[PDB]
Amino acid sequence: GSSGSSGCRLLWDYVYQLLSDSRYENFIRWEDKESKIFRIVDPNGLARLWGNHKNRTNMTYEKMSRALRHYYKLNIIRKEPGQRLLFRFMKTPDEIMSGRTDRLEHLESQELSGPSSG
Template sequence: MLLTAIAKFSTVMPGYTSRMWSQDYKPQYWSKYLVWQWLKQMVDMYQIDAASIPFQNFDVDGRQLCSMTCQDFTRAAGTVGPILYHSLNELKWSGGILFLMLTCLYFLDIFDPSCQCLAPVASPTTSSPDTRGTHLWEFIRDILLNPERNSGLLKWEDRTDGVFRFLKSETVAQLWGKKKNNSSMTYEKLSRAMRYYYKREILEHVDGRRLVYKFGKNAQGWRESEK
């Protein structure tokens, strides 16, 4: 079953597993993206309230993550810090194989292998209640945070201020629709949902610029590491 999952995963994410089989599966060699994947899995596995974890505190690669002490984890994630710390240590001892297994199963649950564009686009977060759920703004954020996978869908205009622009608005809308099993999604509808975020200060209004949005103070996890 697991081997089947890994095999399928390899077809879905060519190149990805091969890298992992080499050395990337060891926590010390994780990219920032893999660190995020691991965090999401921890949230799922331990049913942690994702809102309680400031994800921006984990904008680090595997080497930096492994150098963090239990105290560092507590500072970064509060009461769940020790859980994360001990879980990471287990992975260090297992050489990360466990993470590879979980990742394969996790991706299989999320991605439709028939989807060519397959955009791990949005490694969806698991913080919200919908199916494998991500909110729209998180979906957008995750595309922006994975530029190697976004195929020019969105672009940072001002990375520091969180200003970004849609390059392929209809394509993003279709991907969002695919994620929500809604084939009739359009940019018109997606943008309406985006505008609702102004009120909640997840997004801020950008004056006079088409297709340009800005993350607001209630949007988390998009900032670059201060390091």
């Protein structure tokens, strides 16, 4: 029961890791497995886990969704208009699971904290 060693350090992905484990249902479960649709049961709590293992502080859902959004542009996830915290996995996640250069990974510890110094 050891899940400390990580690498991807990604949010959008952090989702699956949870879904797979039913023990994390109360926080998040599969809405419509038919279309790999998931929904955050409780953001206030769900985020905690994301900010906890991330050694972050006062991890809020606001600064969290900041990621899922970036992907929305890549045409990977779709946020239903009606619902509020609904996410639909259009394309397979493992399809874009890689790390060579300027890959999604890069955005693992970027949209979390720190200026752009641009």
